[PDB]
Design brief:
The structure is cut from a larger assembly and holds chains A (450 residues) and B (55 residues). Chain A is mostly helical and 450 residues long. Helices cover 34% and strands 3% of the residues of chain A. Chain A has a domain of 255 residues: Tubulin/FtsZ, GTPase domain (Rossmann fold, 3-Layer(aba) Sandwich), CATH 3.40.50.1440. In chain A, helix 6 crosses helix 12. Chain A is globular. With 55 residues, chain B is an all-alpha fold. Chain B has one domain. Chain B is 67% helix and 0% strand. Classes of the chains: A mainly alpha (450), B mainly alpha (55). At the A-B interface, loops of A face loops of B. Chain A: Its cofactor is Mg(2+). Chain A: Keywords: Acetylation, Cell projection, Cilium, Cytoplasm, Cytoskeleton, Flagellum, GTP-binding, Hydrolase, Isopeptide bond, Magnesium, Metal-binding, Methylation, Microtubule, Nitration, Nucleotide-binding, Phosphoprotein. Chain A: One of its GO terms (cellular component) is microtubule. Chain A: GO terms for molecular function: GTP binding; hydrolase activity; metal ion binding; structural constituent of cytoskeleton.
Chain lengths: 450, 55
């Protein structure tokens, strides 16, 4: 449960400092240097006070190794709005910036600090015996991007053994970013980060842009509001190991009931019962419409039709704050009808997880006193349209051959791109063809594939 | 005598497959209707014509 937190890239370091200061305001870590609730230095030693333990200097500092060869993100995590609450001396800067080029990181520009990050992970991996995996904050191409996550994952699978490799593989919106080459690294992701991992997640940026421009109506279509909402989703997922109690539905059975298969590796997220700062005027606190607008595309990160995507698993999660008996009271609300199209060889029921202790609210953003949540996270075959969109983008770019000579004279290979295409095709066909109900193998005589 | 008769046994009574219990009710119903027409048209008209063949 003392999992090693890696944060590379500009998005990784950005949401790393943001989310760890959200833990600081969540666990009470005041800018004094220590909490006023529990007087143990740095951090506590409870079941949930376990992210913060003794590694640095006896002060139980927050535990996250921050490495990126882009030096300006290391500067603004060193010179942001908090100067001592992170690791006082363990953040090492990067000397030369990759500057939006992924392929330099895996072969040329990031190879000098691989020994240093191996030393850091050997420092932070011989620690306390609780280690259920890795809280990887993956990125594609912002800073170094997929380079350090890729080399860390491959040498962690061939050198550290078979530990779980929980990923936050962000698939950002091209509108808010500036790169164009991003399909190349997003499809090399399958070759270098997908097979040798063991568990993964998905965070997105298109739906937050869509609600911020149209629905939530916040005039901030940049990475800052994306960080402000992904901080909420990271706090929501870490509340399992952060809010221990009677209903501590933690990571232990979570990693079991997420993924069924090798290449059913990619879950989905549908957290959006959000109430805005311009909606923060004592409005309706709803437990009905947050159940009634689940399969509508508002909560979905990628606009997909639920009418075509069959589900082999479904993990329901309603984290509130009001009553532990409201678990039963919300069981007896809407779950009785639920005629949802399923694979003919999967279960039907919905798991339940609540955290009835109320949290501490993040100030200075676009959120009200949020207390309750809905998230229908599962592995769905309805992301086949999103991966077909990505493959259409990559097929058009490979017909255009943009930055091919940029991405071949450093260590890559056209046959390596062919094998990456085959890996992407395997991840497709485990969701396109095998992922749908394959009942057409029993027997009939019409002229089919015998 | 035996030619059309015995070779018609050797074909037609070698032309009866077991049904398919795997599959949903629609294809099973189609195989059932083809079965209940197949054995009726194998026994009825063939032993009618082997009855009134020449006596």
């Amino acid at each position: 449960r003392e999992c090693i937190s890696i944060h590379v890239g500009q998005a990784g370091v950005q949401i790393g400092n943001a989310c760890w200061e959200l833990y600081c305001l969540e666990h009470g870590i005041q800018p004094d240097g220590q909490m006023p609730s529990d007087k143990t230095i740095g951090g506590g030693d409870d079941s949930f006070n376990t992210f913060f333990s003794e590694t640095g200097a006896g002060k139980h500092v927050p535990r996250a190794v921050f490495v990126d060869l882009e030096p300006t993100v290391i500067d603004e995590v060193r010179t942001g709005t908090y100067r001592q609450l992170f690791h006082p001396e363990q953040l090492i800067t990067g000397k030369e910036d990759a500057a939006n080029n992924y392929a330099r990181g895996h072969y040329t520009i990031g190879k000098e600090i691989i020994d240093l990050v191996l030393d850091r992970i050997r420092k932070l991996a011989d620690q306390c015996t609780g280690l259920q995996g890795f809280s990887v904050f993956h990125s594609f191409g912002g800073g170094t991007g997929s380079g350090f996550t890729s080399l860390l994952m491959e040498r962690l699978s061939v050198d550290y053994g078979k530990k779980s490799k929980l990923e936050f593989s962000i698939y950002p919106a091209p509108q808010v970013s500036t790169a164009v080459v991003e399909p190349y690294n997003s499809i090399l992701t399958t070759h270098t980060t997908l097979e040798h991992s063991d568990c993964a997640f998905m965070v997105d940026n298109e739906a937050i842009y869509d609600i911020c421009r149209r629905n939530l109506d916040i005039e901030r279509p940049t990475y800052t509001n994306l960080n402000r909402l992904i901080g909420q989703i990271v706090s929501s997922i870490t509340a399992s190991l952060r809010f221990d109690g009677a209903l501590n539905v933690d990571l232990t059975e979570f990693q079991t009931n997420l993924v069924p298969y090798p290449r059913a590796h990619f879950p989905l997220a549908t957290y959006a019962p959000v109430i805005s700062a311009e909606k923060a005027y004592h409005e309706q606190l709803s437990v009905a419409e947050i159940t009634n607008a689940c399969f509508e595309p508002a909560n979905q990160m990628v606009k997909c039709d639920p009418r075509h995507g069959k589900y082999m698993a479904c993990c329901l999660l309603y984290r509130g704050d009001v009553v532990p008996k409201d678990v039963n009271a919300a069981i007896a609300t809407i779950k009785t009808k639920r005629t949802i199209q399923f694979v003919d060889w999967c279960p039907t029921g919905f798991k339940v997880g609540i955290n009835y202790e109320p949290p501490t609210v993040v100030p200075g953003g676009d959120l009200a006193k949020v207390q309750r949540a809905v998230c229908m996270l599962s592995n769905t075959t309805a992301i086949a349209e999103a991966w077909a969109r990505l493959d259409h983008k990559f097929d058009l770019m490979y017909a255009k051959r943009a930055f091919v000579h940029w991405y071949v004279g450093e260590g890559m290979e056209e046959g390596e791109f062919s094998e990456a295409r085959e890996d992407m095709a395997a991840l497709e066909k485990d969701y396109e063809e095998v992922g749908v109900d394959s009942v057409e193998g029993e027997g009939e005589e019409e002229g089919e594939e015998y | 005598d035996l030619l059309k008769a015995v070779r018609l046994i050797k074909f037609l009574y070698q032309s009866n497959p077991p049904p398919n219990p795997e599959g949903t009710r629609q294809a099973r119903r189609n195989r059932r209707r083809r079965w209940r027409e197949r054995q009726r048209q194998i026994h009825s008209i063939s032993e009618r014509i082997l009855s009134t063949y020449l006596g």
